Amino acid sequence: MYGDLGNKLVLEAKRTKQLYARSNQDVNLPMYHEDIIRNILKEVSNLRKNTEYLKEQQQLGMLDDKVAKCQYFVTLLCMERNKRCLLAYQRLRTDILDSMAWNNNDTNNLSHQEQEYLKEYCDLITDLKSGDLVDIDLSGSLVPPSDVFIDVRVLKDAGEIQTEYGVFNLIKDSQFFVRQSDVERLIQQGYLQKI
Amino acid sequence: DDDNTEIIKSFKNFILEFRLDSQFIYRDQLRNNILVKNYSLTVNMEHLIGYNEDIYKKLSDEPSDIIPLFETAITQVAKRISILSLPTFQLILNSNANQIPLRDLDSEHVSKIVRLSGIIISTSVLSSRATYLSIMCRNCRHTTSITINNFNVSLPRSCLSNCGPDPYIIIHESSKFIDQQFLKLQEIPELVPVGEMPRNLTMTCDRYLTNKVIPGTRVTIVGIYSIYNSGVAIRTPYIKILGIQSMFTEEEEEEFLQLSRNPKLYEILTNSIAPSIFGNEDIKKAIVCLLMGGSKKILPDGMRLRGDINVLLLAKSQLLKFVEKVSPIAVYTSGKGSSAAGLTASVQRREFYLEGGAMVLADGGVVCIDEFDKMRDEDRVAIHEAMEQQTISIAKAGITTVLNSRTSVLAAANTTILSRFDMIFIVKDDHNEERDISIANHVINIHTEISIEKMKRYITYCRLKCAPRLSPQAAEKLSSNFVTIRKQLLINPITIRQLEAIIRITESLAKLELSPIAQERHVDEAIRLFQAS
Amino acid sequence: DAVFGDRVRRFQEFLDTFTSYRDSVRSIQVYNSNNAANNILPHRIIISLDDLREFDRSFWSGILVEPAYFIPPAEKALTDLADSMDDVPHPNASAVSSRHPWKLSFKGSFGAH
Amino acid sequence: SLPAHLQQTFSPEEIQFIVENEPIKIFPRITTRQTRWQLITTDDKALNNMVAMRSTEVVLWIALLLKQQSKCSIVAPQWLTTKELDRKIQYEKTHPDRFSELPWNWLVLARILFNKAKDDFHDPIHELRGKIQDLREIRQIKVLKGLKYLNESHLQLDNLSLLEINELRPFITEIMDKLREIHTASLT
Amino acid sequence: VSPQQDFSDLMKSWKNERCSPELLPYPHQLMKRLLNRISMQSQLIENISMGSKLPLLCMETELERLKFVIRSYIRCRLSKIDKFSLYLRQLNEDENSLISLTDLLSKDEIKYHDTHSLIWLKLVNDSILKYMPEELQAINDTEGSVNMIDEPDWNKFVFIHVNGPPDGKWNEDPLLQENEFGKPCYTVTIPDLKEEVELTIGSIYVMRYEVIRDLLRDDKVALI
Amino acid sequence: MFRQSSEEEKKLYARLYESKLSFYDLPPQGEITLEQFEIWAIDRLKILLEIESCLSRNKSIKEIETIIKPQFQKLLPFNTESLEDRKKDYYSHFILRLCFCRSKELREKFVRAETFLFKIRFNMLTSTDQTKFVQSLDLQFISNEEKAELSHQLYQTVSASLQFQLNLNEEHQRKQYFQQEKFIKLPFENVIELVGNRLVFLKDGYAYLPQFQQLNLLSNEFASKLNQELIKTYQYLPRLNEDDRLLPILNHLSSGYT
Amino acid sequence: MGYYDIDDVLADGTEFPCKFQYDIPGLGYLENNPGRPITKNTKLSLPLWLARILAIVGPVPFVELLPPDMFSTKVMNAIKTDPVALDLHSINSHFFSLAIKWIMLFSEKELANVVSELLLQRAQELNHHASSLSITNIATSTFLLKLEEMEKEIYKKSHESYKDTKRWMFK
Ligand SMILES: [Zn+2]
């Protein structure tokens, strides 16, 4: 029946939601199901052809008052349920991409419409981040500031690097005593640990 | 009289006050245990020693007397933290004291806490002991009660409310009981002196320590070593136990799904099977099909359609061992079998009984036979029912039963018996000196593509998740090929029992891709691989 | 001792309320009385435990957790119900002192047990 | 956009942040009274006009900032003493349904001051650490009795601390919402 | 007006915005004044730095503490705008609406809402709706078998704490009646059940949102 | 801890039969039919006729209970939530007031039969229902010190009664029950029937009555108040004479007792 | 009950028994035969998103809904005897959603009373297992295999809250 493919597709949305929720660090949303979506759209095209043929028979006068009305109505419901399934799946993957855009601001699994969508949303984020309200780093940390000064140990040999506060030389397994407001970005990037 | 109160007070204050850093660990444990209706506490000896060594000294001198006092202290603390009724709580201990080997326990250790280890070899059924017990007095019909505790009692004779010499009886209608179990511990195999059979002990546990272990497991035990009545002035020893020590994730199935969409998965799985063996491509393909299997079906009129696969092989020793290793469930045997049951089953004798061979035992899994020609006479006829029906039925000497034989058979040898198998092939050899030299070098090394475990888990996943169906195009293709071969043979046999085998091979081939429908791609490879000859 | 009587009264109320069990008593009695004048059905009745739950929870849990104190008085009440209903006169010597009361049985929704 | 675990609730870090804005009494060891602090979210006069060993009142986060070094000492709140906690435990036992009238931030402030200011108390700390535990356990019993009255309409609570409410929030609200959904569906 | 009072108002707005189900109106004036103050304080810190260490430490960490709250607040509001985009657009399109969208949202929020709606519309319109028949091509359809527009759950349960009138004018508040021998109180009617409750000053409650919306707007209660 | 927060005729009869028995205390209201009047009166009359017949045959309380109890479900139901049954019972009693207030013999016979029916129905109650019904009627227990001072005499008085009436053959059981039993003090003239049988202890003109006895006081109060109401009902029989359609029914009802 | 909610999308696909009240041409594909009519008093199992409409639209509507097995009398008695021990996961994965949908459809009064008691009684043991934090696996695991998909979310969001508070405190 016409809803089986949608019932199969939505299970992938539930699966990827649970996989994403289990581990926030391991976000790689799986392959876009091009084939199942194509099959669903082909089914919708078949139903459209059936409705058009039924309209031709209605214009021919083939008991069109009762027979065409009920058959057309039942077909319309079948199309609407497929629309709901497709929109739900795409909306879930859109939400995951929106979550990733805020932190970042690789591509192979995304469909090309989604590939341009992510670029558009990154442009929107940097537009908000610029201009007025620039003084607060909207993409910054959401954990309240606990301490000014911390001790951080050097995890990866990135060599000498530049930062707005100054310059660091990340000699492997050396330790700094430095203010957190400087090294917050480098901790997020993963060069440093708090010990 | 006062000493019983001071000791209880001391242990009560122990539970209420022991912090390590910032958490009252035992108050938290005792609260968290009650919420899941677990009435016990797991104390650690080292913390008790750290808190106050005198309490540990008292506990070490006279365990049998002092353990109940600490238990009732646990109850008194348990009521405060949860009530503005509960049973008596069980104390459980952990320790790191030096293990005594089981062979060295002797008269110096009676009524001492002992830590030992071994292998559990037997387990009794559960039995009932009394804790609170009510009493009726026969003459005057007065009533009273008694509280038992299980440490090393009989009904009293001080009649009350003359009242007689032995007037008391039990009201089981208003009494409380607990569980009890017996176990046997055998000394460790790598500790026995040479040329002797291993020594063993018997032991007891109750309440939450019951039903915690099974036969054959190596364990560590903490318990009181004591004696009981059962020569002159001689008694048997035993131990009272106080402590014992002994489906897919999402990230797993993601790897299996990535493998499923590989365009060359069939080649990869064939290459991964017995990689040392040179050549023999179709043998490896057939073993893949045997491992994966078809799809079971049940019809409205009750007829039942088989899923298993059967293969025969006419170097060959290695492949059966590999199949044993890779398969989720596997049994290995030679043609004569492990007993007089042979392969299938037999009746033996004194009253008669029945036992099954290595076809009943492998039910639900795979079975591999090392030399099919050494099959016994009864098995030669019984394997017909074992393979066609997946059952074995016997009516002999008053026995009348039927046995399940749901399994896939692999076999090798070196006649009409070949008809039972879905595919038959003959092993082939090649004699490259480099191969032998490499094998010899590896042998000297020990003397001086997908891995097995991953492949086994993948096979399990595919068996659990999918069971595909034929498409109509495959049906037309197969029927046309069937009538074509029968007509060709007529003008110059194929039968329905082989068409239904080709269908199973087709389904097993479609199973690898996790495609819900089988297709002409699979039908072509099925008939291509059908060339046993 | 006094609690025994009240439980008999409460089960009598139950037997009067749910009338389908009176019909069972009477049908067994009249069937046995008919063929006696010429097989015999037992003096046993099966009650639905759900009816007893919906009638009185305290009696239901009493039956299901303390059977030794609740099953006997209910059986006594059933025997009283069957005895008060009309019966054949002039019983024989064996019938006069048979020591044979009616007996109960249960069905439905045991839950955890 | 916002993380999933912050859609409906405050994390304990935010609860600590909220509590830190309260005032607290201190003894400074240095005189600042005649640069100046020039704060923008608080009063600035108190810090600019400090005199050594003269009691004064400042926000808690600056107080902990000073106490990190030698320049300050923190006076404990008056409720955080053995006599008062004894009386509150007796109140808890006496009235088996009402909650005792402790301040809304008692757990958070106790577990901040025991870490940052262990040396400034008058009572022995190892007794306070026990009496706090007693109070929390009794309150947990009273909470566990209360969850049998979740209903379709409302509930009343009194003197329940902020952290205790935040601990329970997602359970109470969810179960109450589903009971509301079941009830209103029959009306419609 | 003072710098001390603005931060208390900011904390109030942040806490209320986190819990309530609907999108509350933007404080237009407070944000202007706060952001100007942040800029001036940053320049002052730079000037004093270029000119005892401890006062500078206090000033720096205070500015960090101030910026964090605003960051969290704006992120929460944008998250709400994501979920009710079609609802807000429908509210704006209604000519008879009692409130305009620009009253509710800030200018940056207006920009975000508009352009994000267009981006999301372009994604689904080409992918899915390009293939549907003309009867089902609408994205914000109300008439279908399932409503395509989401909106707030006005009956969500929320914790509250009763403050009373902010000025302490218990004698002036017209709604604030009095219970027997005790504190003043408010009264509210819950209409599905046809029942009343008395909300005494100082006591905590779990209450439906719509029943207490008006008192929340008047600052008679505060969300916990 | 957590915390949340005509019709009048039907309510009147629900109140009147909450206790499951009534002294028939209050004026009925609303309407019923004349067929209902006749039939309800005849049903109660049949039950009371059988009660008087059994008493004339000198049958015991248990025999009368065995005879009369099956008739409630047919004629005059008892222990019932039905408004119809409750109204039937109440109205039938009130009708037989007007039938049997006419003469001293009729008043005595009606009081005797109705009081015995009251006794029968009271026996059918549970002890909780009996306690609630007695308490609803606004009906002096002795102090523990007075019980202790008179304990020997009271126990000597009631010990035989405990054995025979409450089946407490064991003296131990009798002692425990007596320890748990309460006693009532009142003038001896109020319980004189128990005095004549020496079932109560007398001291200074007061009779000491255990709690498990004393139902005769309740039934005697019922009989006395019913007699006074019947005397009152007799005095305003001229107002009954305004409706001629009722007098043949009452004459028919009274004819079975004459 | 949002549009894009996955669980609501998935719950609507469960099938319910149905019976027809008119013969209709060409709709035999519901009976898995596109080339034939449907006939009156035929019985079929249809998904809820379709049966919810065909039961309403006219007069006599096209389809009548038969009482499904998941709301049978045996289930109700099992609920009312011991709600805590009940294996609702085996009965139906989405019980409390379909219950509310059915109550809305038919405006049942007694079923609501039963379901409210069931939810309230199971929430107690759910909170008990939520509160119990290690400083055990089998005792918790036996009960948590009998939770609905609806109840698992509440359990997870309660457990994480308690765990976060404990971690912050003892730190
Ligand atoms: Zn005795």
Summarize the structure.
The structure is cut from a larger assembly and holds 7 protein chains of 7 kinds. With 258 residues, chain F is mainly alpha-helical.
Describe the structure.
- This is part of a larger assembly, with 7 protein chains of 7 kinds.
- With 113 residues, chain C is mainly α.
- Chain C is 62% helix and 9% strand.
- In chain C, helix 1 packs across helix 5 (67-84) and helix 4 (57-65) packs across helix 5.
- The two termini of chain C are 29 Å apart.
- With 188 residues, chain D is mainly alpha-helical.
- Chain D has one domain.
- Helices cover 49% and strands 9% of the residues of chain D.
- Chain D contains 7 helices and 4 strands, in the order H-E-H-E-H-E-H-H-H-E-H.
- Chain D has helices at residues 12-19, 45-48, 60-67, 82-94, 106-116, 125-146, 162-187, and strands spanning 23-28, 56-59, 72-74, 155-157.
- Chain F is mostly helical and 258 residues long.
- Chain F has 13 helices and 3 strands.
- A 3-stranded antiparallel β-sheet of chain F has the order 1-3-2.
- Classes of the chains: A alpha+beta (195), B alpha/beta (533), C mainly alpha (113), D mainly alpha (188), E alpha+beta (224), F mainly alpha (258), G mainly alpha (171).
- Residues 137, 139-140, 142, 159-161, 163 of chain B line the site of zinc ion (ZN).
Helices and strands in order:
This is part of a larger assembly, with seven protein chains of seven kinds.
Chain A: H1 4-22, H2 34-60, H3 64-104, H4 112-129, E1 149-154, E2 159-163, E3 166-170, E4 175-179, H5 180-189, E5 192-194
Chain B: H1 3-17, H2 25-35, E1 40-44, H3 45-51, H4 53-61, H5 63-80, E2 90-94, E3 112-123, E4 127-130, E5 132-137, E6 143-147, E7 168-171, E8 177-186, E9 200-206, E10 218-228, E11 236-245, H6 250-260, H7 265-271, H8 281-292, E12 297-298, E13 304-305, E14 311-313, H9 316-326, E15 330-333, E16 345-348, E17 353-356, E18 366-369, H10 377-388, E19 391-396, E20 399-404, E21 408-412, E22 423-425, H11 433-447, H12 452-465, E23 469-470, H13 472-491, H14 496-512, E24 517-518, H15 520-529
Parallel strand pairs in B: 1-2, 9-11, 14-21, 14-22, 15-18, 18-21, 23-24
Antiparallel strand pairs in B: 3-8, 3-10, 4-8, 5-6, 5-7, 8-9, 10-11, 12-13, 16-17, 19-20
Helix pairs in contact in B: 1-5, 3-4, 7-8, 14-15
Chain G: H1 6-11, E1 15-20, E2 43-47, H2 48-54, E3 63-65, H3 73-81, H4 88-91, H5 95-106, H6 110-131, H7 137-143, H8 149-170
Antiparallel strand pairs in G: 1-2, 1-3
Helix pairs in contact in G: 6-8
The structure holds zinc ion.
Residues 137, 139-140, 142, 159-161, 163 of chain B line the site of zinc ion.
- The SS-based structural class of chain C is mainly alpha
Helix share bin of chain A: 55-70%
**Total number of beta strands of chain C:** 2
Strand residues, percent of chain C = 5-15%
Helix content of chain C: 55-70%
Keywords (chain D): DNA replication, Nucleus
Family (chain D): Belongs to the GINS2/PSF2 family.
GO biological process, one term (chain D): double-strand break repair via break-induced replication
GO cellular component, one term (chain D): CMG complex
